Amino acid sequence: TTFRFCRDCNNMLYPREDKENNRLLFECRTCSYVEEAGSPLVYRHELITNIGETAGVVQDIGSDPTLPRSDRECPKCHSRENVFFQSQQRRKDTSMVLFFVCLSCSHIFTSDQK
Amino acid sequence: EESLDLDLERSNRQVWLVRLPMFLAEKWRDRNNLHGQELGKIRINKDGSKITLLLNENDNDSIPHEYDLELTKKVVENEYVFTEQNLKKRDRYIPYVKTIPKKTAIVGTVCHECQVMPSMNDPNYHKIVEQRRNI
Amino acid sequence: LPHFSKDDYSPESKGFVENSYLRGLTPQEFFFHAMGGREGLIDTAVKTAETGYIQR
Amino acid sequence: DNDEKLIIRCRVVRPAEEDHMLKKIENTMLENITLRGVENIERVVMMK
Amino acid sequence: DESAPITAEDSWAVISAFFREKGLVSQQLDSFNQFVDYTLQDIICEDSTLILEQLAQHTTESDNISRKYEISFGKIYVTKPMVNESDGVTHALYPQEARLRNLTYSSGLFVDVKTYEAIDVPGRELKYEDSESGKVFIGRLPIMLRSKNCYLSEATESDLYKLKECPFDMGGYFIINGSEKVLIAQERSAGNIVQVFKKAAPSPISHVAEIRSALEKGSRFISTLQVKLYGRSSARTIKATLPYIKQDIPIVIIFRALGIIPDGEILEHICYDVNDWQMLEMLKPCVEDGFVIQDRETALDFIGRRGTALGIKKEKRIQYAKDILQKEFLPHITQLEGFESRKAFFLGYMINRLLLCALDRKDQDDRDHFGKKRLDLAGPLLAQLFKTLFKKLTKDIFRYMQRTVEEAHDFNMKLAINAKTITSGLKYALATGNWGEQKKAMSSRAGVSQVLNRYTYSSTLSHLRRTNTPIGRDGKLAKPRQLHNTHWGLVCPAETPEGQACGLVKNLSLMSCISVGTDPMPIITFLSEWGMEPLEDYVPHQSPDATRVFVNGVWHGVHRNPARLMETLRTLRRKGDINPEVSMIRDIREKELKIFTDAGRVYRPLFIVEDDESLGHKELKVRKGHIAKLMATEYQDEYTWSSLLNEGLVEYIDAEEEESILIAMQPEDLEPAAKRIRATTFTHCEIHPSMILGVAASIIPFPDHNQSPRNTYQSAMGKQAMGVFLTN
Amino acid sequence: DPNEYNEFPLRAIPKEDLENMRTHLLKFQSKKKINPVTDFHLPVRLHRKDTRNLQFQLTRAEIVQRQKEISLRRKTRQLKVLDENAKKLRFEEFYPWVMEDFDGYNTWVGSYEAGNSDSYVLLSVEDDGSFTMIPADKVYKFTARNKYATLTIDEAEKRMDKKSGEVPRWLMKHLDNIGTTTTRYDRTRRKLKA
Ligand SMILES: [Zn+2]
Ligand SMILES: [Zn+2]
């Protein structure tokens, strides 16, 4: 779903169809540069999703004091130290799922006990 | 009398843009100075990658005599120094455009963006630390 | 409240008064009690004028 | 229903410039086509 | 031992020192002292220019001489209260004298006032460019009691009784026509700060972002900027409103006109994580809207007329548009000529914040949060009135100088009527309660100069630290009347009146202090010196993780390491090299850094806790030796609260920071490993919980052990009790 | 220290040489490296010109070819104060810096940014090994223009009017087929052909 831009100018390449060769082309509607289409994918919507929960996972998450600490272990380093926080997606229909990041292994993993 | 076209000859000269700390910039940007006197010495590694400045004793030991020069951008592109001075005294086109001609010439190419920082280990250094702390 | 760790839903963290008047409250619980009292005060202080208009 | 990916494949019949027109079609499909029930009614609860 | 920890009991000594130093009315006193020491020479030297160089008023006339009429004001002067009666000498006043004689405990002013020419007949040109007295009287203005320039601010108890007034009269009221007079704080939403709103569904706008601005306080520079998101659908489009442009304008046109032609750059100014896409998808229609224009001045060529009368024009001057965008647009971060890029980055930041709310990534803004408000006080209010009356002064000075086409320059007598105007205006403002000149009560909120209550010493003290906000006549029922979490430890949660004003008037807690502001220039210079990326050469690609930096709500640069800068600033503050009123916050979740040094913030003291400890787990830095020294100093009848501040033992916290600090209620609550019911990462411990009250509630014994509305009933009622109010 | 380095004291530029001469800093916004001496078609002229209707402006080669082919007051006034240096800056920036090569292949428009002009100081190595110290008074930034044959303002105003819900996705392609408003390099090439 990524967008490409003209090498000659940072401008959105609009897909357009080859009438005779029947393959999608991306032409810079600013300047005559044209480009081949990597995938038949053109536009992507994703009306409902469960993404964006890994937003703002800075390397300094453990630095802040206010995030609570737990005793669960990361299944890479098993160090009981870790920092946990709930879903970043602030909508009324969210879930009580939590996210555990451990300072030692610097890895993020879900709270799913299943 | 002078050719309006700019000179392209003096381009091929490497230039080092230097960001300078306020105290030292105040001294060097003064028009009263700049008589051509030497002011400091530079140290370059044969291996490279580390540059430090050896300031002369003309500073009156009020500021560090040693500084480290850090190349913020080792490689620099599309940056140049051009100099200006006064000259001697669907197909429709616009005839009058009010051109204003000046004598111009490009004199150098910027290749190294670097900043002067006082070496904390310098004995005269860390004094400007308190000076900046007060201000 | 800035005396709690983030993202807690324990009753004390989110404002459950545990103690009784006999022993006396705790700073946080005191604050929450103040909140409730203020709510009651303001709601009545507005409804009085409103419902007076309706009555008239 | 045998397939586990609930997918619909449609194409415009005409005997070209698909972006705007087909996005309009998609919006119409999403916010115009009712399925069952009567509009102006929302979640309904069963009570004993 | 001296390095032993501190029992919760011992905290009281610290409080004793803090009061012994600060004094309760410190807020009002310091506001006035600041307004007198500065902000007055500033307000004059700012606009001290007025010249009438009548060279020839037309070409020649051969030539004539450049008849400069240069008048400028140098240093100003203030006097002790020094008032003469009719037909008599001037007395050295004293508060009781004015109080019984119905005077105004004011003092006079007089300011210095400052031809040699350049001549030009037509060709060449561009080089064609008085006092009559000194320190001319300009008027008299009232004074704050026990201010820097009040007689009482140095009295000794013996001398204080010689002057015959009660030593317990701590408090800065005013004496107007012989009546104790008090001004009250006015809270207002802080300016120059990004906010977003979710407007109601029926309107074609769903999400809006608003910016306020000011210059402190020329022309009032309201200059509201707001960006609206249209449609619910493909009507997704973003338009902005700018003065003096009276159409909604597509933001892409704004970017292009600013000087950013290639669309990819504009995308870089909005989106930061190139990996994410959703924002690009919702921007797609906006990019489509501006697909037609491809040049900066052509975008500038858009009319946005709103007037005034079209001067030199073809359709719209490019010069007109650029002069708008520089001089008037966004009166903050810059307004001079040459910082288009700063404008672009800030506008992109605000667009991004707007877009998040529509994308549900971040929640709705909270208007009622306390920190994003401020408390205007005596200083700023007197500043506003003085500015208005001095503008009237200058306009009148221009008059009667143009009138004296013939001889001569007065320089003397008009300023007498001017002094009458200035003094009359100040007197009227401070006595009537209306706030402004005789403008038929326009914009004149009355509750600014209430009459000081004098029934009970408790009441009197409970009338100084008072606040008020304008909301409406009748009142709403879902807005700041109800208490808020942010109010903790800053405003007393029980000392409020009831009825038609409940929750509006509110009362400062005990140690709460107000921010008097400080020049940010040294701070920003220091920050740049220690390594800053000026935004002029920023690039998101090479900075996928760098942290933005804000000062008083201006973006200045981006930095790589926030941690070291944070600790360095903290240490430098604690060492006392920065005014402690300055507050900084590191929003590590948002990758953001804030610096605040404006005036009018509210802050409280706190114990600092060092996480590290050679003795073991964790410990607050102060020890027993310091408190022993404090007790010794007190009983001497030389540690001060300031002397506690310098060496890093307690630190001020504004209302904004708490969102980045964890607090320990008791100094022993969890520090180590029936009566009643009772993490390991604390940074600060409360000095004492009982200090969250205000003046009146403090009297209530065991306020914990009874219902809160009953405490509110008593807090209100106690002010209606007799007893003593002074001794004189 | 052991001689692992080249030491030489940098020397200042002579004071008397500096006066009456102004030195500025030049910047290009471009993803690809551009070398003025090689890429540009000499002769190259730097002029301070009004930028209105840049496309309609004839190329320097075109101009040379054309030349060869030819061969009551109110009496009471008050002025608000403005800083003299600010007034001079406004006067100088009233016209932008515009640089063109003879061919007209590449055109660049400069702008002035005051963010770091004062703090930055020029240092370039002299022939003897000294480093020339220059206080940099102003820094100018140049951007490319007219490379993509931009459309004109009036037709753009007509398009933005809501005559159509969406403008033709191939409007630029159709205009290029009509070849309206050819590039300055294209116009110069056509003139040279004629
Ligand atoms: Zn292109
Ligand atoms: Zn692990």
**Domain locations along chain A:** 1-45, 46-114
β-sheet bridge partners, residue A109: A100
Provide the token pair at E619. Answer: 């410990």
Q: What is the resolution of this structure in A?
A: 3.5
Provide the token pair at E102. Answer: 């119905």
- Do E355 and E421 belong together in one domain? no
- Do E488 and E502 belong together in one domain? yes
- Do E568 and E443 belong together in one domain? no
Instruction: Please tell me if residue E267 touches chain A, with a CB cutoff of 8 Å.
Output: yes
Is the bond into E61 cis (omega within 30 degrees of 0)?
Answer: yes
Q: Is F132 helix (H, G, I), strand (E, B) or coil?
A: strand
Count CA within 13 A, CB hemisphere, residue E268: 17
d(CA E173, CA E565): 43
* φ, ψ (nearest 5 deg) of residue A109: -150, 155
* D19/A47 touch (CB, cutoff 8 Å), yes or no: no
β-sheet bridge partners, residue E208: E197, E228
Torsion angle in degrees (nearest 10) through CA of E469, E470, E475, E476? -70
- Do E181 and E123 belong together in one domain? no
CA distances to A6, B110, E419, F125 from B78, in Å: 21, 8, 62, 19
Provide the token pair at F122. Answer: 């020029």
Total CB pairs under 8 A between chain E and F: 68
Look up tokens 């996972």; give the residue.
A57
Among the bound ligands, the one closest to the CA of A32: 1
E32: nearest Cα among E148, E110, E140, E141: E148
Residue of E nearest to B133 (CA): E577
Q: Which helix (H) or strand (E) holds E554?
A: strand E554-559
F134: nearest Cα among F30, F48, F21: F21
F121: nearest Cα among E433, B81, E541, B64: B81
The distance of E312 to chain B (nearest Cα, Å) reads: 17
The helices-and-strands tally (H runs, E runs) of chain C is 1, 0
E216: nearest Cα among E398, E29, E374, E397: E374
- Do E167 and E32 belong together in one domain? yes
**CATH pick for A1-45 out of 2.60.40.10, 3.30.1360.200, 2.20.25.10, 2.60.120.560:** 2.20.25.10
E620: nearest Cα among E631, E628, E612: E612
The distance of D32 to chain E (nearest Cα, Å) reads: 12
- Do E431 and E523 belong together in one domain? no
Residues of A in contact with D23 (CB under 8 A): 43
Provide the token pair at A88. Answer: 């970043």
Q: Is E272 helix (H, G, I), strand (E, B) or coil?
A: coil
Instruction: Please tell me if residue E233 touches chain D, with a CB cutoff of 8 Å.
Output: yes
Here the contacts of A24-27 (C-beta below 8 Å, separation 24 or greater) are: A27/F173
* A64/E660 touch (CB, cutoff 8 Å), yes or no: yes
Other CB atoms within 10 Å distance of the CB of residue E89: 6
- Do E203 and E342 belong together in one domain? yes
Provide the token pair at F50. Answer: 């009004």
Burial E205-239 (b: 16+ CB within 10 A, else e): bbbbbbbbbeebeeeebebebbbbbbeeeeebbbb
CATH fold of A46-114: N-terminal domain of TfIIb (2.20.25)
Residue type at B51? I
- Do E15 and E52 belong together in one domain? no
Other CB atoms within 10 Å distance of the CB of residue E47: 14
Cβ-contact E52, E69 below 8 angstroms? yes
Q: What angle is formed at CA E242 by the lines to CA E241 and CA E246, rounded to 5 degrees?
A: 70
Same fold yes or no, A1-45 and A46-114: yes
Cβ-contact E595, E556 below 8 angstroms? no
- Do E17 and E132 belong together in one domain? no
CA distances to A9, C52, F19, F116 from F87, in Å: 37, 66, 21, 20
Q: Residue E237 is part of a domain; what is its CATH number?
A: 3.90.1110.10
Instruction: Please tell me if residue E360 touches chain A, with a CB cutoff of 8 Å.
Output: yes
Residue of A nearest to E268 (CA): A10
The distance of E219 to chain F (nearest Cα, Å) reads: 15
The distance of E659 to chain A (nearest Cα, Å) reads: 9
Cβ-contact B80, B108 below 8 angstroms? yes
Residues 6+ apart with CB under 8 A from E137: E108, E109, E110, E415, E416, E419
Instruction: Please tell me if residue D1 touches chain F, with a CB cutoff of 8 Å.
Output: no
- Do E301 and E362 belong together in one domain? yes
Burial A77-112 (b: 16+ CB within 10 A, else e): eeeeebbbbbbbbeeeeeeeeebbbbbebeeeeeee
Provide the token pair at F110. Answer: 């400069």
Residues of A in contact with F176 (CB under 8 A): 32
Helix axes F184-193, F60-70, angle to 10 degrees: 30
Other CB atoms within 10 Å distance of the CB of residue F122: 22
- Do E337 and E299 belong together in one domain? yes
β-sheet bridge partners, residue E524: none
- Do E288 and E331 belong together in one domain? yes
DSSP assignment of E43-98: HHHHT-EEE--BS-SSS-SS----B--EEEEEEEEE--SEEE-TTSPEEE--HHHH
Say which experimental method was used: cryo-EM
Cβ-contact B69, B42 below 8 angstroms? yes
